[PDB]
Symmetry: C2
Subunit: 165 residues, 2 copies
């Protein structure tokens, strides 16, 4: 992964899994994360209105320009939700970096998908490393494998393994 | 369908399939259709850089704020590309309204999915009404049905059937 990303993540680690995921998502510069960004709401290709760093919800105001700070609060709020949604499903100790990597993965694929994942099963068997490899299976959409998802999962995979090599 | 769209598509008919498809994608106002719109490029959910009416390609200037006029020009080229991609595969005559609906559909799901569809199979065997119904089967992605695609397919289906009712 880009050296600038490694560095932003390392700076974020003291903030814990939330800060780490936040960095993966926005990138150090706010433009350059794993998630696309727009300060004006837009319809994605499944017809869902999206704003900021991929925030979705019925709170989104159509004719409105969101501030950098409004977007930060939305992300924090959404990542808190991700944490609440998956943490009780994780039943072994894991590094804050892996947890952060998982918030990013789930921010993308959704908590339902996480809860029924083979990945989660591997985690709970104490198979931390193998759970990290499972990220590779999540690179398909619309019946097709996507280079952008492959890259995204390799980066998520790397933070996943940040502790263990 | 919304009456405003009905009027727009009706006005577009003399302009052929491309003008019809343009109405569907950009909407009656040119600023609110089936497909989303952004004037600053952004990375979509499969990590692909996008701008304007969902334009993708090697010609996207990341630091540029695009104008409406620029966005419509790009859509125009992309629609001609969709037509080039699918028209040789359609062996029977179909109304312009139906072909316009198909451009919009293929703009969403891609020419690969179209070329292998049961939808196309039915078209070329003359089952036009059956082709149109097939659209309703294209509302799934990431293992779930999306209300936004269901609404889109219904709009595209109505146009697809414009001729015969």
């Amino acid at each position: 992964m880009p050296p600038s990303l490694r560095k932003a993540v390392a700076a974020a680690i003291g903030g814990g899994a939330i800060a780490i995921a936040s960095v993966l998502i926005t990138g150090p510069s706010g433009n350059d994360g794993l998630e696309g960004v727009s300060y004006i709401p837009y319809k994605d290709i499944v017809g869902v209105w999206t704003v900021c760093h991929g925030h979705t919800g019925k709170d989104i105001m159509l004719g409105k320009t969101y501030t950098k700070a409004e977007c930060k609060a939305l992300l924090n709020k959404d990542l808190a939700t991700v944490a609440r949604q998956i943490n009780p499903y994780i039943k072994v100790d894991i590094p804050e970096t892996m947890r952060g990597a998982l918030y990013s993965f789930v921010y993308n694929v959704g908590a339902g998908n996480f809860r029924t994942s083979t990945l989660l099963r591997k985690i709970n068997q104490g198979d931390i490393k193998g759970a990290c490899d499972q990220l590779r299976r999540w690179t398909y959409a619309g019946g097709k494998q996507w280079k952008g998802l492959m890259t995204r999962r390799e980066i998520e995979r790397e933070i996943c393994l940040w502790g263990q090599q």
